[PDB]
């Protein structure tokens, strides 16, 4: 089907004979020449160790919350660690996190019984998932949890339990029987990383290095995790100082601001159009003519 | 005053549905000939104009 335009016609028609006519066989598209990658020129390594390697976590009724911002996040350091009994992610894939880039990350941190790990998931029903700590049903993030019987057992009455992301401080407040003899009855530490995917300037981004920037040529691109393909160009689009992307009626990006120097780049899809094959019948000749629809002959 | 024709269109339904994603294009093949019979109907409309 890629031998010649008549063969693409035969395949389009699902036929070995072709009658006289003009047949729309395919869309011609210029493929990307090279792949651009573009992230903020920032180098601070993110403080995930200050959350994960902390001496004591909080109680689940009174859970900690650390904002992570303005830093480079090598999530491989967490994801490759043998320490974690579960690492389940929602709205993102763990493999994609180093390819990806967020406005902020919120690291929630607390201690639970090993039975209760199941309740730290999107929209769940249960005593943790209402009276203590709940994830949104549309949560985008990772839940990272492990047994801590070697650290948090003694039992250790200093760990206690009673809307999405809600704190609330007779009262049903009670303490865990965490003893080293306890497996579901052990203490477990959990960190929940929540990812903020607003269209504001990204500040927590993977270690994936930026390339040089290319213009007036068809490229694949990635700006702050916004992947695409097109002829990047300079533009007269008067972005106001707060604006970061531009959009068209299809709700697709048609301009971006470069995160390393704040110029406004137009995005246009690479040269493309319908291909129509003009043929006499194959009973007459195997010769064909090709119409590249709406393109100028200089583009072909 | 009488209408005689209307704007001839073609919609490349693989580009409309999947936007040059190959990951989506491979899923769209599992719907079979829905895309070729959409192009066949629009081409019949266009030749009729």
């Amino acid at each position: 089907c890629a031998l010649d335009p008549l063969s693409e016609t035969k395949c389009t028609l699902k036929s070995f004979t072709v009658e006289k006519g003009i047949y729309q066989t395919s869309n011609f598209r210029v493929q990307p020449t090279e792949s651009i990658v573009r992230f903020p020129n920032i180098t601070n390594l993110c403080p995930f160790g200050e959350v994960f390697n902390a001496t004591r976590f909080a109680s689940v009724y009174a859970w900690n919350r650390k904002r992570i911002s303005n830093c480079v996040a090598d999530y491989s350091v967490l994801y490759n660690s043998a320490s974690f009994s579960t690492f389940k992610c929602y709205g993102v894939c763990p493999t994609k996190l180093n390819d990806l880039c967020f406005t902020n990350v919120y690291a929630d941190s607390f201690v639970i019984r090993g039975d209760e790990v199941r309740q730290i998931a999107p929209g769940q029903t249960g005593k943790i998932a209402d009276y203590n700590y709940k994830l949104p049903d549309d949560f985008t993030g990772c839940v990272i949890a492990w047994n801590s019987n070697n650290l948090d057992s003694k039992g250790n009455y200093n760990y206690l339990y009673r809307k999405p992301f809600e704190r609330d401080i007779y009262f049903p407040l009670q303490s865990y029987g965490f003893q080293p003899t306890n497996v579901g009855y052990q203490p477990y530490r959990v960190v929940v990383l929540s990812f903020e995917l607003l269209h504001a300037p990204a500040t927590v981004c993977g270690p994936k290095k930026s390339t040089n920037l290319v213009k007036n040529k068809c490229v694949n691109f990635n700006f702050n995790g916004l992947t695409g393909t097109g002829v990047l160009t300079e533009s007269n689009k008067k972005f106001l100082p707060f604006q970061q992307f531009g959009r068209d009626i299809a709700d697709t990006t048609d301009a971006v601001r470069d995160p390393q120097t704040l110029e406004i780049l137009d995005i246009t899809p690479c040269s493309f159009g319908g291909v129509s094959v003009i043929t006499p019948g194959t009973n007459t000749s195997n010769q064909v003519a090709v119409l590249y629809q709406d393109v100028n002959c200089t583009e072909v | 005053i009488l209408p005689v024709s209307m704007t001839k269109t073609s919609v490349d339904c693989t580009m409309y549905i999947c936007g040059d994603s190959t990951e989506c294009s491979n899923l769209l093949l599992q719907y079979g000939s829905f895309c070729t019979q959409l192009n066949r109907a629009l081409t019949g409309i266009a030749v009729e104009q």
Binding site: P269, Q293 | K8, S10, V11, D12
Partner: peptide, 22 residues
């Protein structure tokens, strides 16, 4: 003629007869 007046795979094809042929 004066009184009468989409990268997404949508396209408009020209008519066979131009206005000058009509």
């Amino acid at each position: 003629f004066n009184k009468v007046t989409k990268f997404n795979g949508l396209t408009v094809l020209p008519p066979l007869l131009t206005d000058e042929m009509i």
